[model samples]
Target: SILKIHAREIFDSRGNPTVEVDLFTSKGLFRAAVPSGASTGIYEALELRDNDKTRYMGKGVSKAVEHINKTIAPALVSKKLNVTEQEKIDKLMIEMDGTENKSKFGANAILGVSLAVCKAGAVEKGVPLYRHIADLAGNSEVILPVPAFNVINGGSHAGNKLAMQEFMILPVGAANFREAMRIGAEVYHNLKNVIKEKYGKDATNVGDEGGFAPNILENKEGLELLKTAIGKAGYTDKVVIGMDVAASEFFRSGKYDLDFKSPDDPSRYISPDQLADLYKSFIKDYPVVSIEDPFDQDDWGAWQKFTASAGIQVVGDDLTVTNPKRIAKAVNEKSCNCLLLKVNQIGSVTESLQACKLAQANGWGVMVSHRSGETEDTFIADLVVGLCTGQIKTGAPCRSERLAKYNQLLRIEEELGSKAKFAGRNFRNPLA
Candidate 1:
């Protein structure tokens, strides 16, 4: 039987209030914290917090923290936890929530407990956390993923006026996680220097994800700036590019107000086909390895068309939400070739792994990711490595929140020694 559980108020990387949970079992005590998101998707599951309107501009999570301390902990204390029955515990939480979107209990409250239990179970079993996660996912074969670095920020993640969201650099050439980090950091610093040289020193100021959020207004300029940095760092061929267009931000009223056009063009909204053509041009002129959420989430036809035509990885972030059913639906519709798994999208580790399972069964690629308003919790690093997913996107190469995951991966690699397998060129070949 479980011993007891406790909850507390915590702060994430953004200095905003969040949730932290601790689980106690006959074996020992385990603790975990929930990370928050800044550039959140509309369709994603709700993260519960109090809208008191007076504190933190109603961004406070005190109510959810109280719910955990009172409701969830008391109920869970009476139940038994086992290493093999993680899903059972998660399901109990879901049933208690009794809501389709986890609104009754809040995703934040449920997820904090969920992560805590997973860690608790691992400690009870006397194994590494990744090993526990792998066992939970029903897999033992693990593959280290190629780290995707968000070196340039735009759209909602930054204060800039650029059209797209994140501009990333992928170290597909590195031999290991440590080597990949070295390569990514070098390019990231070089990108900063390039930005300062072209846009001025103030332009080097960072955004939410630790990428430069400069006054530069052009979308194409961000990509060009990234390219110049990669070239300047002598990693032009070693690193490829990836973009999170996050099209849902600007799509509206049956027409896409993408704000993507030549500088002199007066057009604010463009047809979906025109946007697709523009992306096609970007693919042709650049070495873009991945494009995510290129169209509005509901634009299934455009998604299918873009996936069919683009040779690079086409990932679904807003479209999937890490829901197994949603992932299956995307697969049935041929929407995209890859899935972005965020645990809170489904509000539990069990469900997130299930989503990954569905994607893997279909031979689709999986990219484990972190949200922008996150904490220093390094659980995702273990999840990606343990599940052996071949790709990860956890903000830029700066910031303690982002660094926590990357640093955890570094430790996991050293722990695994020669067994750790970096994605490298295999990421391209796998998605190919």
Candidate 2:
């Protein structure tokens, strides 16, 4: 039997108060908090409807919070425990699934509730939450880094900048870290050659006045150049390159316009076909490694096709929302080869961990990620290293937030009493 449940309202520097609900029992403690920045706009649309593909959606976090307070909260109150309580809660939450909401809400809502339930169960069982979960799912001492990169500019589409958040590449299961690094370096080199050929040596440099060059998707010449470079890269037995295609490039409301046409009007959006072509081209040429979110989240069919194409690992981030149920569907449907794990997306460290566990259980690659809007929270770096998953995607390794993450992993390696093996940057060869 559950002992007690509690809820709290906590506020950040921005003065936004997040609702945190906790369920406690004698065995353990389960807690859930609405994660930061997830309260507003389209994310709220996700909370109310479970999916955000609707037309009448408005842009406010308060509305979603209110809905959770009024409808979601009330429904969750005083629910009796069951054997498959998490599954049951998930089912109930789906009622609020947004028709247009691409992110399924069941997982998000259940994630919160699962914490509470598990905490209670843990208390009753007298074990830690992590221990309990680990007992159910075997624990690995090796944590791997998931490396993510963002193409701010230089792609065919020219806009303010493209932010590819939380795309991770794993180095685990490889024969050695050096092998992984080789593949990544080769891929980066191919990309560099493609950039130079398309935009000329001047366009390849980000330091130029234009700042953004080598736009591959929008520029036909750029795409051809990329293809040619990939062809020359030579796909062999040991090396491979992949993509993280974070779709954040399209989240702009009105700031800048996307310039391509194949994926619909660039002013509006890029079609899945156009993106798929890019994927196909990569696979056809280089010994491609992985591709994450080649298209928008709602393009479920395209995701299905990409995964089914075989010979490559098709990953999802915007498409999965880092929620378990949606991820389950993607897995069951074989929609993706891996799942990119971001804590902030779901707004909780625990939820993010849960997603990681689910991904691992399903044989999907679990990549812990960093967000564009990030703090110096390098906790993920340690988690990845401890888990030994084998790849981390934290962008150029130039900025503090990013550098801090990489450095943290280095420290972990130091503490581990050995060199932390790492797969170097993707798609680039060493400047010989």
Candidate 3:
């Protein structure tokens, strides 16, 4: 039985106000904080915000919080649903909203309570969060995900001229989760020195995801920087590369602009085929095993063509937005080989699980991700392990908001002890 539900406005890592919920059950109180995104997909569930410029500069989430306190709390309490009835609770909230995107009460309001309810369910069932999530998803084996550390920032994530959003490294050769963290941390430190030596001391500053925001104009130079860091860390063979191109940010009238940050110059735009050729060159020159959102979200033809030819993991973020309809379309067309699962994108735990199941059933990899504006909450860490997704990219091995998830993974691994399994090189196909 649930006794009380409380909602409040809190600040995320980016200092933006967000919704946080506290649910009181007979056992204890469960809490959750909803994260925000800087460059969210257009099709994602509505994240309601108060446009009151006087409060938090129009980023106030008080309206979402009010919905939770006044509308959802009373209705849900009257329903008499058990704390463990997760899907029922989520469905009830969705139906109450009665919109395609949960716009009435706001996805932020609904997701905050939904997550707190999930935590309450886990406690009531007398299980760890990960174990409860595994049961919810019908997954028997819980595996530690290969950490894709975002070591360099670009695109919408930084003020730099580079068009790609993120440049990451995956410690696929590590023996265990602990070792993976060590390798990632070592490489991050090495990269800091590399950037400082080449670009200057100011270049070592980090961006939204805690990745170094070097003022480099060339995308290839970012790859070279990563290559240098991996080599200097002496784990060139152990670590591989990944990139989040976020190409939709630079998609200019059916052409991609590699220098969209500087000026409006259409003459320098590259065609989709030319961009595909550039990606091919990167794969050939570096140890790149994954590329995300390389083509514009609406450019279905480009996605199909590149995915068919590229042997690497082609991930869909903007293209899918963690929606079942979008994921199904991408799967049918073979638009991408992986799904970037963002819980907030779909707005509830139940829907996010469905999306993951759909992606996995189609033999595509799933990478659980955090928004650029994160919180201290580490729910996604348990999610990746429970679902056995085997891949995650929270950020670099820095910033407490980012490390909160990694630290939770370490604790989960330690808790599992001998039963623990690291995805490592099989990150893309951990179930196999």
Candidate 4:
């Protein structure tokens, strides 16, 4: 059973394109979903017919919307979608990549539309979306939290710092909330001990007050604090840390002038040498479970160097953009050891899954993540659990929306009534 999909394009006040696709089934249930952030290029392409960079990117979102309306909608338009056929529907749409007007779509657009199609397909099949995807892929049931943490203060961008919450913490190999918590607590305490020992009480006070200093922008006191923190935190056997430098620490020109006054300022960029030194400092102090976007995302050379030196999981978020091709390129080039998977970044669930598969196949750690601007869409939480990748990076223990993810995992563990191998812990309490 399938249904008809209605497609509508909306615009922001600026007249930018914002498309919506709704799948209406024969059973009278309508399912709707939107694409994550749309690139300006995709928006511009929707306005124009060109396939330039901007247009090509913009067309991705539009193409995705159109695909759902055409292929998926027609199939399920009047049929009683047998929710089990969700995967079948998705597989069918995958065949239409070469069709008219759809050939130039972006991953996000395709994903958004495909997700809609799958929703209808799932309803037809009478199974949950997660179950359908799991059935298709044959993944295990190991859900982990995507803990996103932030360093609101400390480093060269000190007072100029604002909370840029993008770093995600996926538990690659731990089970259950208590174990995850223990991992987090151990790392936190270790980090605190290192910080205290290196900088004395003042250094501990510095981290307690300002957070750990940035490797690229550390003073003697800051370096001392980091040395101690890493020494203690890095010693933990269970928990590990992932860094999303956000490429804000470095610019295209590769300089570290500390002139950038805010996260928006482009001048506060660090050079490759500076980044290498930063990574060296990071490894020297913290165990550094994973370091991401350490260089300007496009700086492939820097990524290689950092990955080689760290020998830990050097992950790519901004670099890969959830594109399997890009991820493949990075893998071939030995640019990273892991991928930070974000469904919204690439726009399609299928493509995102493809990217994850590619990473997993290449022996890279696959981490599910959240965006800085997020909703309580626990789809990822379930995905992580069912798939059992055992790694997620959402962030520090704050915000119910954020904590809702961890709480959901606890429930999953309780319901499963088994040791669901979860990883990562809360650094909130070191001694405990």
Query: Which candidate leads the pack in lDDT?
Result: 3
lDDT of each: 0.84, 0.48, 0.95, 0.52
In candidate 4 the C-alpha lDDT for residue 389 amounts to 54
- Displacement of residue 344 (Cα, Å) in model 4 is 2.4
Single out the weakest 10-residue window by summed lDDT for candidate 3: 76-85
Candidate 3 lDDT over residue span 1-432, tens digit each: 878999999999989999999999899999999999887888889999999999888999999999999999999888778988899999999999999999999999999999999999999999999999999999989999999999999998887898899999999999999999999999999999999999899999999999999999999999999999999999988999999999988999999999999979889999999999999999999999999999998899999999999899999998999999999999999999999999899899999999999999999999999999999999999999999999999999989899999999999999999989999999999979
Q: CA shift at 352, candidate 2, in angstroms? A: 1.7
Candidate 3, which segments miss by more than 4 Å at Cα? none
Per-residue lDDT tens digits of candidate 1, residues 71-107? 9888877665563478998999899989988988899
Top candidate, metric TM-score: 3
lDDT head-to-head 3 vs 4, winner: 3
Count clashing residue pairs per candidate. Answer: 1, 65, 0, 61
Candidate number with the higher lDDT (1 or 4): 1
Report lDDT (Cα) of residue 118, candidate 3: 91
> Residue 307 lDDT in model 4?
82
What global local distance difference test value does model 3 have? 0.95
Candidate 1 TM-score over all chains jointly:
0.96
